[PDB]
Amino acid sequence: YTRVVWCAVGPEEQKKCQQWSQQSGQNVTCATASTTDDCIVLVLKGEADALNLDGGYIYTAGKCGLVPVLAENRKSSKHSSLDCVLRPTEGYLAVAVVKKANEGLTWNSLKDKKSCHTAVDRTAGWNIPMGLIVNQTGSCAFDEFFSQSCAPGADPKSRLCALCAGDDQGLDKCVPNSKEKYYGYTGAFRCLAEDVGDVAFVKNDTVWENTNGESTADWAKNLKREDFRLLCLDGTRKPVTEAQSCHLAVAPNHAVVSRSDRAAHVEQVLLHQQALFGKNGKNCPDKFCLFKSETKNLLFNDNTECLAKLGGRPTYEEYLGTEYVTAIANLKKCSLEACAF
Ligand SMILES: *[C@@H]1O[C@H](CO)[C@@H](O[C@@H]2O[C@H](CO)[C@@H](O[C@@H]3O[C@H](CO)[C@@H](O)[C@H](O)[C@@H]3O)[C@H](O)[C@H]2NC(C)=O)[C@H](O)[C@H]1NC(C)=O
Ligand SMILES: *[C@@H]1O[C@H](CO)[C@@H](O[C@@H]2O[C@H](CO)[C@@H](O)[C@H](O)[C@H]2NC(C)=O)[C@H](O)[C@H]1NC(C)=O
Ligand SMILES: *[C@@H]1O[C@H](CO)[C@@H](O[C@@H]2O[C@H](CO)[C@@H](O)[C@H](O)[C@H]2NC(C)=O)[C@H](O)[C@H]1NC(C)=O
């Protein structure tokens, strides 16, 4: 059935998509929206087929009837010569990161500091750290906990957007797409590295990928792992090598979602597209790589080894788990079941 329309979020994902579209022979084409929620509406209307989503957005989409199709999978220590496509996903570690030089900042003294978040509604950037903090303060006024924030996706006039920079020209401040300089895993870690915020809520991988030479980006060239600490829930501070034992939670991997009636077809095309543009793919290193965009995580995370079949044919609830779903239900109370569209 066998053409797929991919939904790109913002102009740089559009660029990368049009490139993929060309190389694929128009087997994949591109719709673009300004936000993930908008791409979710395109999918429901049937005007696009699929896009890859963080867990907090798999929640939104799943209430509207969309279904997990294929999950991002990275380099697992355990689970050895099992083919990547069939290997269970591990999850990723959500962490809070601070500068070592900012002595005496711990989980217990976050109040009134400056924070950097991936975007409103994302797992490691928003849902986990704010669900914890609402639980802890027994208060729904998360908008008043940090003194200033960059939380792309909140009111550009509020203090939740005060730290956001916008694009090259200072436009589009606090849009939840990669035009916002501090958007996403990479933008929130940048927000911290340049000392705009005191704390970044990212995942474990982000600190490694942008330190000790792994990046090459001008802001990240000189960043050293030993210059950062993770904040643990018991009040302590650990080197970034201790994430197994100092994280806020383990997150379900980003996954491709589609409308249930398109799922089989979307799944077939993507297995064949990764055969060509994935890690060992026929055409990757030389014509086109799907999982590469210079640390920008465009369409897919740059560390993705493959897209993996699911097994258990899970619903979105089962995919996310009862642990994670009740956390979001509870947090959403502050802002009991319906498609928000
Ligand atoms: C913030 O606090 C709320 C309220 O405590 C957390 O939601 C609550 O989560 C618990 C445990 O995950 C749910 O209870 C039960 O857990 C046992 C353990 O296996 C299980 O056997 C039961 O099936 C049940 O799920 C409980 O429903 C839920 N409570 C309410 C009133 O909603 C939430 O996890 C916390 N937020 C974060 C992000 O930490
Ligand atoms: C565009 O899509 C079609 C359908 O998948 C591809 O044409 C098929 O290629 C497969 C695998 O190489 C063959 O075994 C089929 O017999 C072909 N026929 C069909 C189903 O039409 C084509 O490979 C795709 N093009 C690119 C460059 O990605
Ligand atoms: C935190 O993230 C880093 C970055 O992904 C993980 O380290 C990588 O681990 C794989 C094998 O598991 C190695 O092949 C890579 O060379 C490592 N990458 C880098 C950039 O150093 C690390 O394992 C994660 N830590 C935990 C505890 O999950």
Ligand SMILES: CC(C)Cc1ccc([C@H](C)C(=O)O)cc1
């Ligand atoms: C660790 C992460 C990748 C996911 C994860 C955790 C639990 C479950 C089951 C269905 C559940 O917790 O309800 C599924 C997936």
Ligand SMILES: [Fe+3]
């Ligand atoms: Fe995420």
Ligand SMILES: [Zn+2]
């Ligand atoms: Zn844990």
Ligand SMILES: [Zn+2]
């Ligand atoms: Zn099931």
